[PDB]
Design a protein around this ligand. Structure first.
Ligand SMILES: Nc1ncnc2c1ncn2[C@@H]1O[C@H](COP(=O)(O)OP(=O)(O)OP(=O)(O)O)[C@@H](O)[C@H]1O
Lengths: 471, 41, 578, 470, 193, 193
């Protein structure tokens, strides 16, 4: 435990891998230190071991290594990260080292970065409504505390802005929930993999403006940093998040900037090891890896904290059938999918409601949680918007002049919906204002066309005009 | 109709290319495993 | 016992040397902590072991020991109301021993060995016993659980315990040959439990959903597959079947899916009521949860454990429903395994034997004469998760060739929040003709004809939708617009169902018959009106359509009166038009 | 005799056995485990180093220390007899009906030989299937390879059973004719479920068709290699009967999609890189070795006719299975889901169906002189009727001419009375009568494709002859 | 071998006005015809054989169906030579293959036919070679290449399909034989996509 | 290395109305200009070099036409620096690895150009870096990985292609030099899909 065991006998350095011969006493998954001839130390992890040799994945670049002056030493058998309450207000890199000038943190515990699966019996039901301030999320794709709700983005779409806005505006509404008023904010664990300087400066300035750096832990893996380092960043971030939530009663919001980059690192390692790959060259176990990451959210019986995840990924050619978005959606509890068509029209946030989803929305809406009309109003909005898009496809065939009055009304509804309900800029809307706007838009259709809403709610809320809100 | 034909051609090309790439990968991996067996069994 | 040492560790795969004599597909204890594994390859003196747990921290040279037996399930009293893992570890006991996390190397008995059971013998000394006969009985949550002779056991009874309270370890019956039969036995999980004969299904498996029970029925010993992309509502459908089906016992297998879906069942079912017995719903339920971040090798185990438990409850003379949350995750686990083995893939990387394994699993379903002469049944509903929503994937296509009913889900409908969101054009059932006698005897004499009339209407609407997409709906003639409108009425008032409503979450066959009859009568009278020169606009404004559209929400007790009023009102409305 | 115990590798479906240079390529072997259970397998590779055995079923209990391999036979053979009629087998030829095994007259290699092209002769006589849409519009000719293209949920099994029950030859219709000629049906079902197995057993037993049939039934949960062998054994029996006992043999191969999936699986199990769309690069040759085992030979009274049945994977005729099958076969009978969901049975759609050899097996001296023109006219009239049916939805019935309306009525009558015959057994004369009754709805002289003699002779029939039995 | 390959300056008279006028083929030329069903390709090929100015005819069936091959083998014997009135088979060499005959034979069929054609050319005759279904020959080639474990191109065909077809078709031509006489081979292929 | 990375706040004026107005680039930003052959990549980049408001231009001809390098060499010495007033060539560094020059040197050319640009930034200059085609750099990496016997990702390229591209583009930025002055490197990247 206190004795240093070195392994000369490196027989191969190529790409991110390194073979060492007589290392039969290196555990599977152990962390190692690779010392070069000039005394520089670089890290790696044992990913295969046999009597013949051990395969090490190097976390840095391999420049300057030689098969004569390099040695591998054992750091620890199981990859662990020292955690403490004092991680708040600190900035670390992809392997959890300080990058802000302060000294290293004194651990209260060292936890395995891989973690362990939460027992399903131990889990709670995620039920607390979070008010993001974005109407397309609050009304139609509600976010509940304990949920894993990613953002499916494009190349030039504003996903970082949406994530920053959600962090800035997200709050629970104890007044509606019937719970005693309490002012516990969100702690934000922010993990960036392959993030450019432009996006990072945006996020950092936004947090500094909001004053959220004091209650944030940042694991930053930039785009000029080693790619294989990205394998550990999400796991370190989620180790810290789980620790804070389920040992210190924090309500943690975890932002994972770009999961496409993580998948790129995974594919790199898979190809180096000559594994038989799956789709588009990605490893066949990518579902399991992504589940090891995403399933570290939720809420636990008998504990007050929570972990909420909002991964952000870029669908490569705006392609939802690409393996990364596809597997993610199969793992996560919904998705908020942006649209380039709305973005080009100038609509912000450019959230397209039809392809978005929130699995747990029914858990945290309705009488005693948000308002008794919420679910039916969301259903009615979906139906009306779908009819509008269909009539848009129809005008290209028949021509506008041939439309019926109801078809024209649905066209007008679709336009107004996009321009007033989805387009809200950087404004923070309460669920009450969002439902008011939704009802104003629904009042543009005849009261008998609202078949998903009960007549009690139609009596109570139908009628108000949009001009009363604006203009 | 020409637009639909163009889309069909494009999708066919993409799918055939993906199949070709996967086949090349399998052949490469199996050849390398065979060489490894020859070298060290 | 065969003993050896680790030679190589690559992820969940361990190569052990010194295992000469080890058998294929036998369980082995790996490492100093005895991690449960399985032998999947034998090569000279080496064996290829799949660890059912995480292998991080293991070292070369650690011992590997073979149990000499394949994966087996403990079958007997103590399973209902229970939640298990992929290899039948109770999760409540893991929760007590471990904290809120599942750790490796936990050994816990499947059945409780300290609970006592009120044994009532049903054999007496000198009686011959054969595999599958009833030796006695035990109460369990309103079921008369019956102890069965293990299928491959024979002999004559020497002594029988008197009626009393004993644990499942008690040798309740002893045979002249010396065999001591306890309340439970062990069965290899990859062997189908034998039955006397399989019978042709003749009774429906009522799910409570109109579209499935009417247009795409599944019989009591049948098999259904429900494929779709994420968001289309597979889990909601499976849980509705768990809540509302007419099966005596429900087995729910969470193969490699979200843990919140298991939490939902655990939290909610204890508060719900069994449709028939009346007691708590969780008392007729067995959960096998192997979530997505739980060991990959345990997914195959979860599927086969579930099917074995279901076959046991069938051998007891019950009707059992088995729900597989995703057979796609089972297939992906197979693919991961094969890639680790460096096998030659087929199609999208899957092992060649995937189709054979699916066929073997789905052929364990059916209605049977049990070895005890009773009648039990297993109905399997498997969900498929094609990548990209592509139904041309190997898994979906291989399922499509062995199942009886195919409930295709549509992304377009799920995007509009139209649930159940079944693609009518792409769905089918092979059980309709076999269930007609039952429908005549138990629903209505002309139910088959009404169902066929609805189907013909839907096909006509599908035919005219091409012209509608070509020229728009207003260009159609009056009769064709009437067909389009009545198809829409069917879609919104009959096929649409609200799982979260208090009444509409479940529909009886008679309520479905009533709604169908309403819609058909309306169609006939509208056709007669159009032949006499009544505008469509004036037809679609008739208020009786609102009654037809609200039929879904009328409670089961109030529905007959509502239906008689509506049948009178339709005739009145189209008579008043003159 | 000799038992090989030098087993040095077991993995998935394969086991390697050393010191086994005495095993022929493709020999069938028995595998005995420690518990005493006996499995089966086939030699798929033999070398001086070892032989590779593909194991039927599962390799669960096998161990390297106690397993032993033995030779059953060097070449897969089937013992055939005329006593095979009325019997049910399992795909490798083992009885599954409980009656005693058959004593064979001879044992034959299942992978028979290719017929010499110069010994073949033209198909010139027809088989009456009893189904009007086939008998009249897509005639089946003795020696033809005529597949049924089905879909996912369509009643292909019922149509197969109906043809098996009704198929017959018509010696009386062939000029002078003959008193009787023997007829047999060989039914190969591959990858079927228990429900389908029960349906087939009951169908053959109730109508008595079993007495003139041989059934090779392979379940979906049986070994894949048995699926591969099932059609070969079926056709070996068919060739035996036809070309050594002058039988007229009809072969129905119930799911060739299942066969091709099994072929793909076995290819992957032998470590062969898949060809187009995952299927073996030799799939064309294998399907040819199966399909091409039908025909009519010069100097022999018998014949072999095949009806393969395919479920087009996603209704795609461009899928490799149906593409290759069309390349090898001589037409196709296409089922339709529109007709099925409208209630019509058998749901055979005449428009996309074709029998390439129909013209050589219909006409004077075989069927009736009016057959060809009646078929052509029915096709044209039905196509016009369907087009007008789409046109009415837009321009209404008033805007149609009287002839367009008559075609509109004829199309519905055609669907209701010609296609929709239910479980009837219609002789060719009854079907031709129904066809003439339907054509009588169209005005004489609008039947361009029929000579005036036939019109005079048969035109004028009334629909009441079939109105009472749709 | 030949001594010289002459130019395409003389016509190959099929006897059919449409081909002989609108779309002529020269002596030593090459033509391709697609075979749809029901188009009467068989009668057209038979008339080319009957009425062409070719002295000898080589008909190669490379991978046909059994019944199409039987049709060919039962019809040609009964055809009559317009020049002599004797059986047309007396100036015809026929190569017949079926789909279920060895793939090597189906692959070598066109080569055997062309070699025979060139022999009769070197004797100083005009020979018409008709290769029915070169698509079936390409299928045989694709299968052979798969069995040799070669990297496929396009729809699974080997990357040398075009070159093999070119080498085959370029054996056609009018030549001066090594013996100093004029002889020709004219190839008419068929394609069935 | 640099002291600090700044936020781009001034424009990279190009001389093209469309790029300057609708789709601008900041003085230390990155742009990609992909296009099919014949669309105007080379003309656009040469115009960037002739008219841009950068102090220094490093123009990298990675695996492209040699006539383009000759065109630059011949023409620029006669044009005038828009701001300095001297000859345009005097503000330009040319790195040329044409298409028929060795393949592996394409990667070296990219890295050499970006390092020189960083140097001139470190002197306090605003530097424009034009990469004539990063597609040819990707092709070189694919070739070398073929020789290494590595396993490819999509379309044969090595899986670390995105990492290399990212590392190359992240060297752009407005910065505070170690000497305390303000520098900037702007990268425009041509891609030839
Ligand atoms: N020149 C011609 N003069 C008169 N009738 C002809 C002529 N050419 C063809 N036909 C007729 O047209 C028919 C064409 O269609 P058919 O299906 O019979 O042709 P096929 O030769 O069997 O087919 P394929 O095109 O596959 O060779 C020929 O069979 C023959 O009846």
């Amino acid at each position: 435990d206190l004795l240093k065991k070195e392994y000369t006998g490196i027989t191969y350095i190529s790409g991110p891998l390194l073979f060492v011969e007589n290392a039969k006493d290196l555990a599977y998954g152990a962390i190692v230190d690779i010392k070069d001839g000039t005394g520089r130390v670089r890290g790696g992890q044992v990913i295969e071991v046999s009597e013949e040799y051990a395969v090490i994945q190097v976390f840095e670049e391999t420049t300057g290594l030689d098969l004569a002056t390099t040695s591998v030493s054992l750091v620890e058998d199981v990859a662990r990260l020292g955690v403490s309450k004092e991680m708040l207000g600190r900035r670390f890199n992809g392997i959890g080292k300080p990058i802000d000038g302060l000294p290293p943190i004194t651990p209260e515990k060292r936890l395995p970065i891989t973690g362990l699966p939460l027992n399903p019996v131990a889990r709670r039901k995620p039920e607390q409504f979070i008010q993001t301030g974005i109407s397309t999320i609050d009304v139609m794709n509600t976010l509940v505390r304990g949920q894993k709700l990613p953002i499916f983005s494009g190349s030039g779409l504003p996903a970082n802005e949406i994530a920053a806005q959600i962090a800035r505006q997200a709050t629970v509404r104890p007044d509606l929930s019937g719970e005693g008023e309490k002012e516990e904010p969100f702690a934000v664990v922010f993990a960036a993999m392959g993030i450019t300087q432009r996006e990072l400066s945006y996020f950092i300035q936004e947090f500094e403006r909001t004053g959220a750096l004091s209650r944030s832990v940042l694991f930053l893996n930039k785009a000029d940093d080693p790619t294989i380092e990205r394998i550990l960043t999400p796991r370190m971030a989620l180790t810290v998040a789980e620790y804070l939530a389920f040992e210190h009663d924090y309500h943690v919001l975890v932002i994972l900037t770009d999961m496409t980059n993580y998948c790129e690192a995974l594919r790199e390692i898979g190809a180096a090891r000559e594994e038989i790959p799956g789709r588009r060259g990605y490893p066949g176990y990518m579902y399991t890896d992504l589940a090891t990451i995403y399933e570290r959210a939720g809420v636990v019986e008998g504990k007050k904290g929570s972990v909420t995840q909002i991964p952000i990924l870029s669908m490569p050619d705006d392609d939802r059938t690409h393996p990364i978005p596809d597997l993610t959606g199969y793992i996560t509890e919904g998705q908020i999918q942006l649209s380039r068509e709305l973005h080009r029209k100038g609509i912000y946030p450019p959230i397209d409601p039809l392809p978005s989803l929130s699995r747990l929305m029914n858990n945290g809406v309705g009488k005693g949680k948000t308002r008794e009309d919420h679910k039916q109003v969301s259903d009615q909005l979906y139906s009306a918007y779908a009819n509008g898009v269909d009539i848009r496809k129809l005008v290209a065939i028949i021509g506008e002049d041939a439309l019926t009055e109801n078809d024209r009304r649905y066209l007008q509804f679709a336009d107004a919906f996009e321009r007033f309900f989805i387009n809200q800029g950087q404004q923070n809307r309460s669920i009450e204002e969002s439902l008011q706007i939704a009802w104003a838009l629904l009042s543009m259709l005849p009261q008998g066309e609202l078949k998903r809403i009960s007549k009690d709610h139609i009596g109570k809320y139908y009628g108000q005009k949009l001009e009363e809100i604006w203009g | 109709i020409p637009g639909i034909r163009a889309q069909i051609r494009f999708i066919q090309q993409v799918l055939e290319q993906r199949e070709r790439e996967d086949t090349f990968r399998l052949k490469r991996i199996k050849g390398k495993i065979e060489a490894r067996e020859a070298e060290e069994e | 016992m065969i003993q050896g040492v680790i030679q190589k560790i690559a992820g969940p795969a361990v190569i052990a040397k010194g295992m000469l004599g080890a058998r294929m597909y036998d369980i082995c204890k790996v490492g100093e902590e005895g991690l449960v594994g399985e032998i999947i390859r034998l090569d000279g003196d080496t064996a290829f072991v799949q660890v059912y747990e995480d292998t991080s921290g293991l070292k070369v040279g650690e011992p590997v020991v073979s149990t000499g037996l394949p994966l087996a399930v403990e079958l007997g009293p103590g399973m209902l109301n229970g939640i298990y893992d992929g290899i039948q570890r109770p999760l409540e006991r893991i929760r007590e021993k471990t904290g809120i996390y599942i750790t490796r190397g936990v050994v816990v008995h499947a059945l409780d060995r300290e609970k006592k059971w009120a044994w009532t013998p049903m054999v007496k000394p000198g009686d011959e016993v054969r595999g599958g006969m009833v030796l006695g009985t035990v109460p369990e949550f309103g079921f008369t659980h019956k102890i069965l002779v293990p299928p491959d056991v024979r002999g004559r009874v020497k002594e029988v315990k008197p009626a009393g309270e004993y644990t499942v370890e008690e040798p309740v019956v002893v045979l002249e040959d010396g065999t001591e039969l306890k309340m439970y036995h062990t069965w290899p999980v990859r062997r189908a439990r034998p039955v006397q004969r399989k019978l042709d299904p003749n009774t429906p498996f009522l799910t409570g959903m109109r579209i499935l029970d009417v247009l795409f029925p599944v019989a009591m010993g049948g098999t259904a597959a429900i494929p779709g992309p994420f968001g289309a509502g597979k889990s909601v459908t499976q849980q509705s079947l768990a809540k509302w089906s007419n099966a005596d016992v429900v087995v729910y297998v969470g193969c490699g899916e979200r843990g919140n879906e298991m939490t939902d069942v655990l939290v909610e079912f204890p508060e719900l009521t069994d449709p028939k017995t009346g007691g708590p719903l969780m008392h007729r339920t067995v959960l096998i949860a192997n979530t997505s971040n739980m060991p990959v090798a345990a997914r195959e185990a979860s599927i086969y454990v579930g099917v074995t438990i279901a076959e046991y409850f069938r051998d007891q003379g019950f009707s059992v429903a088995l729900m597989a949350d995703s057979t796609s995750r089972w297939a992906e686990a197979l693919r991961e395994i094969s890639s680790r083995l460096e096998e030659m893939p087929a199609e999208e990387g899957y092992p060649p034997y995937l189709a054979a394994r699916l066929a073997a699993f789905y052929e364990r379903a059916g209605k049977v004469i049990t070895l005890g002469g009773e009648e039990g049944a297993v109905t399997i509903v498997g969900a498929v998760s094609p990548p990209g929503g592509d139904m041309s994937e190997p898994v979906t296509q291989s399922t499509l060739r062995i199942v009886g009913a195919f409930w295709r889900l549509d992304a377009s409908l799920a995007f509009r929040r139209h649930f159940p969101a079944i693609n009518w054009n792409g769905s089918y059932s092979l059980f309709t003709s076999a269930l007609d006698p039952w429908y005549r005897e138990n629903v209505a004499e002309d139910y088959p004809e009404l169902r066929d009339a609805i189907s013909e209407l839907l096909q006509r609407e599908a035919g005219l939708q091409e012209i509608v997409q070509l020229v728009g709906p207003d260009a159609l003639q009056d009769a064709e617009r009437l067909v389009i409108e009545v198809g829409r009425i069917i879609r919104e008032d009959f096929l649409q169902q609200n799982a979260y409503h208090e009444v509409d979450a479940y529909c009886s066959m008679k309520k479905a018959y009533g709604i169908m009859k309403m819609i058909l009568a309306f169609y006939k009278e509208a056709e007669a009106a159009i032949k006499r020169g009544v505008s469509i606009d004036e037809i679609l404004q008739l208020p009786v359509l609102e009654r037809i559209g609200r039929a879904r929400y009328v409670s089961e007790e109030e529905f007959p009166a509502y239906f008689e009023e509506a049948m009178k009102e339709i005739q009145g409305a189209f008579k008043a038009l003159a």
